[PDB]
Amino acid sequence: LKARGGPKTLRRTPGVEPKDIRVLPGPLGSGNFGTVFRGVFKGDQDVVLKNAKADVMAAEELLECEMDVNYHVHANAKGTCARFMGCIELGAKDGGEIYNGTLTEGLWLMWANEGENTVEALMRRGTAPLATAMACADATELGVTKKAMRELLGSLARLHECGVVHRDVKPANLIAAEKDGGVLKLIDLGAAALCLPLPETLNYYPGDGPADPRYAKADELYLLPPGSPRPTKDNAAKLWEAHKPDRFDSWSAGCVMLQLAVVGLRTDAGLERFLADYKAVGYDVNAFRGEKSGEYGTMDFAALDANGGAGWDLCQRLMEAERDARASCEAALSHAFFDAAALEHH
């Protein structure tokens, strides 16, 4: 007597069939657990596709969580991130080959291709191509920083409002979306947490988690401190207020601001140098300006100095050593840095 076989259950999005998708060879990148490819959907829609790495422990489960968070964001924070177009799951015999333009076995996620750039790529080419991609009329460090940060903080505020902490905020995960007026959109919710029970928290736990060492505060690589109780539907709100996991994104946003504002900080080594000095002076911006900035003769901090040092003050708020002192992204959005020019004389 043999065990019977049975159907395979596959996840699918209404309107999206495997036949509809052509994948383009050559990954745009590989992250911790997955690989991203360019694709064409229904003949003329430019999309991007992500699958799980076969060689990485738990990769499918990590992608499943990214999928869940993407659905949450699609429902609650439209426009903050790349437009989510759903999923497609394929079986063994029904899978093809990447180098032949067909989706291979396993779960795939799909988004609109929001643009061929990232802010990291653009800023490293220069403030000018960055401002052009952003449709930013004030093509200066100050101009791009004001526009970019208003957009990033606005989006982070909306994410946090619906319980999502992105946890991988950085220029490489921002695209200037030319089809939507150049507005910045976040990508990559692969490390994101849902910190409210809707119906349950996702990817949210005590202790250290995935982080980009350049953009996460070195002694604060957690959303919940290692001693914290595990989150439950009953304690989530208390934990949100107590441990302020959203302040993880605040620090990262401060790092983004530093790089947009100061050309010399756009390289990894540049920002790394600044942060080491910043830590050395006790996470005190005024201390850095007084004791350290003289050492940065090759750089220009004009965007941060402008208007009573408003840029520096906003960085200080986003980058306080203590979470309890660090500004929320929502609060930061109301900072003087973002004030409209008075008496413009049009």
Which residues are annotated as part of the binding site for ADP?
30-31, 50, 112, 114
Pairing mode, strands 183-186 and 193-194: unpaired
Q: Which residue type does 235 have?
A: N
51, 173, 293, 328: which one binds ligand ANP (CB under 6 A)? 173
Q: Which does 193 bind (CB under 5 to 8 A by kind): a copy of itself, Mg ion, ligand ANP, none?
A: none
Active site residues: 168
From residue 68, alpha-carbon distances to 71, 109, 241, 299 in Å are 5, 11, 24, 43
**Dist. CA 157–CA 192, nearest whole Å:** 14
73, 144, 187, 196: which one binds ligand ANP (CB under 6 A)? 187
Using the rule CB under 8 A, is 245 a contact of a copy of itself? Answer: no
1, 92, 340, 342: which one binds a copy of itself (CB under 8 A)? 92
**Dist. CA 217–CA 211, nearest whole Å:** 9
141, 151, 188, 246: which one binds ligand ANP (CB under 6 A)? 188
Instruction: Tell me the binding residues for ATP.
Output: 50
3-state secondary structure at position 214: coil
The 10-49 site mask, x for binding ligand ANP (CB under 6 A), equals ------------------xxxx--x-x-----------x-
Nearer to a copy of itself, 181 or 294 (CB): 294
Pairing mode, strands 164-165 and 45-52: unpaired
Q: H helices within the chain, ranges in order?
A: 59-76, 119-125, 127-133, 141-161, 236-243, 247-261, 268-280, 285-287, 302-318, 329-333
Residues that bind a copy of itself (CB under 8 A): 2-3, 5, 27, 29-32, 54-60, 92, 95, 105, 170, 172, 208, 210-214, 216, 221, 267-270, 294-295
